[PDB]
RNA sequence: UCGAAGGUGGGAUCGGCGAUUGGGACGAAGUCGUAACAAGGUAGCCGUACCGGAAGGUGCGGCUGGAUC
RNA sequence: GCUCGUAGGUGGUUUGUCGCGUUGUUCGUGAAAUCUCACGGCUUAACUGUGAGCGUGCGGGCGAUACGGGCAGACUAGAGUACUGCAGGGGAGACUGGAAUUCCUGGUGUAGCGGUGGAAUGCGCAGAUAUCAGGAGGAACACCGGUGGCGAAGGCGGGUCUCUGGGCAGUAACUGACGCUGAGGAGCGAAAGCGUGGGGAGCGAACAGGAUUAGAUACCCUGGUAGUCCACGCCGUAAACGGUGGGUACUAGGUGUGGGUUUCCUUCCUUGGGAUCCGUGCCGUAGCUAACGCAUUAAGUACCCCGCCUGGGGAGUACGGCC
RNA sequence: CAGCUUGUUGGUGGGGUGACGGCCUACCAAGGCGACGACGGGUAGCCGGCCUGAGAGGGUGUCCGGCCACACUGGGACUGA
RNA sequence: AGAAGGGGGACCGGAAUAUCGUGAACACCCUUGCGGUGGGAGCGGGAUCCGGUCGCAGAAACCAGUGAGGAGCGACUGUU
RNA sequence: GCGGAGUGAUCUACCCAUGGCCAGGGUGAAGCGCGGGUAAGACCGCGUGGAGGCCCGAACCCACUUAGGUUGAAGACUGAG
């Protein structure tokens, strides 16, 4: 899902400067929202393997991004972990 | 480890036959009379007499302490 | 106190033999069929299952490394 | 079989610094003998002595910074995000439609039907087949339909609704190398098969009868159980095939077809031509190949990572272990 | 051969030694090694060298020379530089 | 599976005066109660380490599983 | 032994209502917490908990073996298991 305005609340809350859409924080927030929503989808429809694969790809992408932000600035990494969740 | 620090050393050396440069890591154990050193913390060491069964290094100085 | 050798015990592990039994290979000019190679006389192979003296047969799905106008 | 991903390996353009890699030089060491080159001595030679090499290396000092690497930055070309469009049998769930087969009930109706190369077994005369009306139930979805589309692969087509994944193009708005591959590992994975429960029209392993035959544990015929279907788990194999691992760049063309964008010819209404991006086919040059063939969708030219091979059998088998 | 380790890993005070040291002891902490193969099994003295090879490699360690280990099998100390 | 197979066990003293663990008197606040906090007395409990003592023997008398292996039948507890 | 009519469940068999009883030890199920593990999970390690026609063993209920009894203490018992 994630209609335009639905992405807008997330981008306003997690982006950097009023037009930020590609920063690691914004991307991680959007990926987390998509992952959550697809998880409630997959709690019903246990046999939608073709969508569970999309979930797996999103998880992998988010893991790369989290690794990158940790490498580049540990303070930003820690703040983002506390703002969203880990483990 | 109570006044002991464990430091990982990496070195690269040409392969004897194939000629590629292989990277390998070691793990030496060093001495801290005043134990102040945390994880990360690139450090400098100097090898010394057998201060213990396995310790042969002494911490010199903690340069560019961990982030 | 430590202590070799010795004794007791339960295991581990590496080999040998073993009535009987499973397959394998090689043997002559033995017996039974004819499965494959040609459309090999029911196209053949692959996975699986059941069946049958034996090569094998049949079902389901697959492939052309088969045909057809 | 396919994918995701851990360690690892490898890494776009650009500035400064370090001098680990790399490279220059010098000092120490690399015993002697043996080895090589030149002499010297045994009558020659083997043998022996001397001198120089060699000793690929390692350690110390002093130089260099092109490339690799580290450290500190920068950039947008790779990668990702955003917006706007676009095509699709991609997936899951729920409800629902009609054709046809089978059976049941009733009407008409009378002696055959069925089946084969030819027959028989079989069904029927207690009313079959045929024909008409009504009903039950399961499974598969004619035409569209293709060489065509989507999916990582296996695979996916009656319709509607709900939920959901990916792709392409355009813009250039954003981040600023965040990339590639990936040992082990995890997930998915036709059919057959297994467990528990339900369902069962048609088909149909096993099984039975008939026929053929020397025989016929078959092919052909008449029946027929599991199974095929559904729910939830397991199994994890296929000629799982393009018999061709993934990523990237480059190297004549011609001609089909699917999805975009786009000027100009903008009507030449033509939805034709050209250009560009992403697919999917055929044919062909260079090149490659043992040949067959491949040939911008490479089996060509190169670079990065992974898997695998080492004569045929025994054998993908035994033993051990894991599931 | 996938889990090995409890003086084991580290510290403090003592002891011991020619000498540092869990070398030993009391106490304290809970570490240490491992897919770059720990732990286990098989085999083996190591090298200058020797044989082969265009070389890189492969095989080998006999004469000679250097180092190590042992002296019927196992353990122990004494004397002494 | 209590598989099997082994080791310790008595008394006295010391550690030990809060050694440790139970309950918590005298005395310490207060929304004054049948209240709270500290406090640690006296009374009981258990284990260890070290040293010593005695006997043939320290589970002390009474009390209190024998164990292992291979077959047949029936799965098992039960019932006759 | 056969028939008719009656008597018996105060013994024993089963059932029904209503009460009572089962010393002491051991083991450690589900569930629930905590930590680990992951994207989330499965799963793993600890605690807590106290299940079971569970284990050892008195009362209680039985009756497997043996010895005694066998004109018995007793027309079915005693002792030791
Ligand atoms: Mg010390
Ligand atoms: Mg034999
Ligand atoms: Mg055949
Ligand atoms: Mg034949
Ligand atoms: Mg034939
Ligand atoms: Mg044939
Ligand atoms: Mg058959
Ligand atoms: Mg078959
Ligand atoms: Mg077939
Ligand atoms: Mg990596
Ligand atoms: Mg990398
Ligand atoms: Mg690197
Ligand atoms: Mg580079
Ligand atoms: Mg020399
Ligand atoms: Mg001469
Ligand atoms: Mg030098
Ligand atoms: Mg881009
Ligand atoms: Mg379904
Ligand atoms: Mg029917
Ligand atoms: Mg009728
Ligand atoms: Mg009819
Ligand atoms: Mg910028
Ligand atoms: Mg990958
Ligand atoms: Mg792998
Ligand atoms: Mg599965
Ligand atoms: Mg199936
Ligand atoms: Mg089934
Ligand atoms: Mg079966
Ligand atoms: Mg069933
Ligand atoms: Mg049929
Ligand atoms: Mg048939
Ligand atoms: Mg038959
Ligand atoms: Mg295979
Ligand atoms: Mg296929
Ligand atoms: Mg293959
Ligand atoms: Mg490729
Ligand atoms: Mg390639
Ligand atoms: Mg094309
Ligand atoms: Mg060739
Ligand atoms: Mg061609
Ligand atoms: Mg080739
Ligand atoms: Mg096998
Ligand atoms: Mg086996
Ligand atoms: Mg100790
Ligand atoms: Mg000490
Ligand atoms: Mg030897
Ligand atoms: Mg050669
Ligand atoms: Mg010896
Ligand atoms: Mg001798
Ligand atoms: Mg000796
Ligand atoms: Mg002397
Ligand atoms: Mg002396
Ligand atoms: Mg015992
Ligand atoms: Mg036993
Ligand atoms: Mg005595
Ligand atoms: Mg007992
Ligand atoms: Mg038997
Ligand atoms: Mg017998
Ligand atoms: Mg029984
Ligand atoms: Mg049975
Ligand atoms: Mg019992
Ligand atoms: Mg009577
Ligand atoms: Mg009565
Ligand atoms: Mg009890
Ligand atoms: Mg529990
Ligand atoms: Mg019981
Ligand atoms: Mg009992
Ligand atoms: Mg009584
Ligand atoms: Mg009884
Ligand atoms: Mg008797
Ligand atoms: Mg008598
Ligand atoms: Mg008795
Ligand atoms: Mg009794």
UniProtKB/Swiss-Prot annotation, chain A:
GO BP terms: namely: translation
- Could you name the domain of life of the organism this protein comes from? Bacteria
**Which UniProt keywords are listed?**
Ribonucleoprotein, Ribosomal protein, RNA-binding, rRNA-binding
- Mind telling me which InterPro entries this protein's record contains? Ribosomal_uS15, Ribosomal_uS15_bac-type, uS15_NS1_RNA-bd_sf
Give the UniProt entry's GO cellular component terms: cytosolic small ribosomal subunit; plasma membrane
Gene3D superfamilies, sorted: 6.10.250.3130, S15/NS1, RNA-binding
From the UniProt record, which GO molecular function terms apply?
rRNA binding; structural constituent of ribosome
- Nuclease among keywords: no
Record function comment: One of the primary rRNA binding proteins, it binds directly to 16S rRNA where it helps nucleate assembly of the platform of the 30S subunit by binding and bridging several RNA helices of the 16S rRNA.
Q: How does it assemble?
A: Part of the 30S ribosomal subunit. Forms a bridge to the 50S subunit in the 70S ribosome, contacting the 23S rRNA.
Record's family? Belongs to the universal ribosomal protein uS15 family.
Q: What PANTHER family does this protein's entry cite?
A: RIBOSOMAL PROTEIN S15, BACTERIAL AND ORGANELLAR, SMALL RIBOSOMAL SUBUNIT PROTEIN US15M
Supply the HAMAP family for this chain: Ribosomal_uS15_B
Entry protein name: Small ribosomal subunit protein uS15
Recorded source organism is Mycobacterium tuberculosis (strain ATCC 25618 / H37Rv)
Curated annotation (Swiss-Prot), chain B:
Its domain of life reads Bacteria
Q: Which family does it belong to?
A: Belongs to the universal ribosomal protein uS17 family.
Tell me what else is known: Was identified as a high-confidence drug target.
The free-text function statement in the UniProt record for this protein reads: One of the primary rRNA binding proteins, it binds specifically to the 5'-end of 16S ribosomal RNA.
- Describe the protein's quaternary organization and the partners it interacts with: Part of the 30S ribosomal subunit.
Q: Any idea what this protein is called? A: Small ribosomal subunit protein uS17
Organism expressing this protein natively: Mycobacterium tuberculosis (strain ATCC 25618 / H37Rv)
Its gene is: rpsQ
Q: Which residues of the full protein are shown?
A: 69 to 135 of 135
